[PDB]
Paper text:
BP and BM are very similar to PfBDP1‐BRD‐RMM2, with most of the methyl group orientated the same way but also with a much smaller proportion rotated by 180°. The amide does not appear to interact directly with the BP in the crystal, but this does not have to be the case in solution. Based on the two conformations of RMM23 in the PfBDP1‐BRD co‐crystal structure, this should be possible for RMM23 and RMM22, but not for RMM21 (compared to RMM20). Treatment of synchronous ring‐stage 3D7 and NF54 parasite cultures with RMM23 resulted in significantly reduced growth after 48 h of treatment, indicating that the compound blocked parasite development within the same IDC when treatment was initiated. The conditional KD parasites (10 nM Shld1) exhibited increased sensitivity against RMM23, which was reflected by a leftward shift in the dose–response curve compared to standard conditions (500 nM Shld1). In contrast, the EC50 of chloroquine was unchanged. This observation is consistent with RMM23 acting directly on PfBDP1. Analysis of several known PfBDP1 target loci by qPCR revealed significantly diminished enrichment of PfBDP1 in the presence of RMM23, further supporting PfBDP1‐BRD as the main target of RMM23 in P. falciparum parasites.
Possible targets are the nine predicted bromodomain (BRD) proteins, among which PfBDP1 has been identified as essential in the blood stage of P. falciparum.
Author numbering: 3 to 133
The structure:
């Protein structure tokens, strides 16, 4: 019940619930799929954003088991909000929406206790490099 596999199954379920609540939050539809430069009238998006990321890209990596640490899931989610704060002007609707979901995501990490999984990840790496 306390095995490393039980914890690894836990934060995979917490991340899967997190990426669902982000997809359902207000304005979350603008981060679900990757930006189609032609349909959204942004021909220079991938000339500025070189590491694109969307909710669908994170759901796929969760389904294929491509996250080794719980901190890697947060980095992909934060990358979405970082690409949003970069390409979009600070007073644009998208940038405001991105900041609102960013706060929601960070507060959901507190409520769900996901951060405690990242801390134990760091301690385990310490108690492993010491041997
Ligand atoms: C993909 C997308 C879809 C819709 C939709 N179909 O409702 C609305 C907005 C956006 C969107 N998402 C991001 C992440 C952005 C944009 C708009 C373009 C500027 C780049 C940017 O930050």
């Amino acid at each position: 019940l306390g095995s490393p596999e039980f914890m690894n199954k836990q934060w995979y379920l917490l991340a899967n619930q997190l990426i669902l609540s982000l997809s359902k939050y207000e304005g979350g539809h603008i981060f679900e799929k990757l930006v189609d430069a032609k349909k959204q009238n942004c021909p220079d998006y991938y000339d500025v954003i070189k590491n694109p990321m969307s909710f669908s890209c994170i759901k796929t990596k969760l389904k294929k088991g491509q996250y080794a640490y719980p901190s890697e899931f947060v980095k992909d989610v934060q990358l979405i909000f970082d690409n949003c704060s970069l390409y979009n002007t600070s007073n644009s609707v998208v940038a405001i929406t991105g900041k609102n979901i960013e706060t929601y995501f960070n507060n959901q990490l507190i409520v769900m206790g996901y951060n405690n999984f990242i801390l134990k990840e760091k301690k385990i790496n310490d108690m492993l490099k010491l041997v």
